[PDB]
């Protein structure tokens, strides 16, 4: 035989796995529920946002053209931005009243398009599998810790988390070759 799931979603299953740590059965919908279903989502969202912001090889974009407006020359600061830096130099960028501020010149009057290095956010359901498992385990640890202290359920999530961390790093190293002996040649 085989296991063919019925109406599978990548968020409901994650919530169900996070509920299994306590020892409560699954659910069928998210529109209405008790407090626990309303307590897990906040932790999951916060952990996702925290983990996504470290900066990996498939997030960092080294070329992006931000453009100013036409009426009043300014650049907005959307809430989906995580890091703003310049690649080969030092940078002074910050937010002041929902706008881009340059400390070096002490003004917000950009006139021409600028190229920077930034990292944007993505929805939870398009990350690679290993990251999703790592995030779920990390969230489950805190959920168990802050609402129901059980020793047997503990002392295992740590062991699983260490292995998942190692797998994340070893996956990350294969994406980029990183050869040190590059741009070296002469007779």
């Amino acid at each position: 035989a085989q296991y063919i799931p019925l109406n599978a979603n990548d968020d409901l299953d994650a919530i169900n796995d996070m509920l299994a740590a306590i020892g409560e059965p699954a659910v069928l919908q998210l529109d209405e529920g008790n407090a626990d279903v309303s307590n897990a989502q906040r932790i999951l969202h916060r952990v996702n946002r925290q983990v996504q912001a470290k900066g990996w090889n498939f997030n960092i974009n080294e070329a992006a053209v931000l453009t100013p407006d036409v009426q009043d020359n300014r650049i907005r600061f959307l809430p989906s931005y995580l890091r703003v830096m310049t690649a080969g130099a030092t940078s002074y960028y910050s937010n002041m009243g929902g706008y881009l501020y340059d400390l070096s010149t002490q003004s917000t009057t950009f006139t021409d398009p600028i190229t920077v290095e930034l990292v944007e956010m993505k929805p939870f359901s398009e990350m690679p599998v290993v990251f999703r498992d790592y995030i779920v385990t990390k969230a489950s640890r805190e959920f168990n810790a802050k609402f129901f202290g059980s020793p047997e359920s503990e002392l295992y999530l740590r062991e699983q988390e260490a292995e998942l961390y190692q797998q994340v790093m070893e996956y990350e190293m294969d994406t980029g070759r990183y050869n040190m002996m590059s741009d070296i040649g002469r007779d």
Partner: protein, 140 residues
């Protein structure tokens, strides 16, 4: 903040405001000199979505120099309360947001026409005030 303009010529543009549905976003081409040649683009044949915050153009940008994007919320209701049913937060939430959004477009629309004329009236009043007053004080 619900109306923005960018120079024409590029292939990608950014969305910088929240919305409740993908049909509440309007894209149009603007001719600065003669405003009687503006056109409206339709989704599917002119532009497409990559992510909730970016689009791409697919038509020829000839004879045009501004591109405008603005939000237009509808007036029909979203949630329909009925007797003998369970109350949930999403309905309370969706209804609240719909109202706040409309009021925002209303204010942003009206201020644009109001401010300049108010300023002109105030400046004229002040000029007549001080001119006539101190001039006649000195005269008599």
């Amino acid at each position: 903040s619900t109306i923005t303009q960018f120079p024409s010529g590029n292939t990608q543009y950014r969305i910088e405001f929240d919305y409740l549905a993908r049909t509440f976003v309007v894209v149009t081409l603007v001719n600065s000199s003669n405003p009687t040649l503006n056109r409206v683009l339709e989704v599917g044949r002119d532009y497409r979505f990559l992510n909730p915050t970016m689009i791409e153009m697919l038509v020829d940008q000839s004879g045009f120099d501004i591109v405008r994007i603005h939000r237009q919320t509808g007036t029909d209701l979203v949630v329909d309360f009925r007797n003998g049913s369970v109350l949930t937060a999403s309905d309370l939430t969706n209804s609240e947001l719909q109202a706040i959004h409309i009021a925002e477009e209303g204010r942003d629309q009206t201020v644009d026409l109001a401010k300049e004329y108010a300023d002109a009236a105030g400046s004229s009043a002040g000029n007549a005030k001080d001119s006539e007053d101190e001039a006649r004080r000195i005269a008599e």
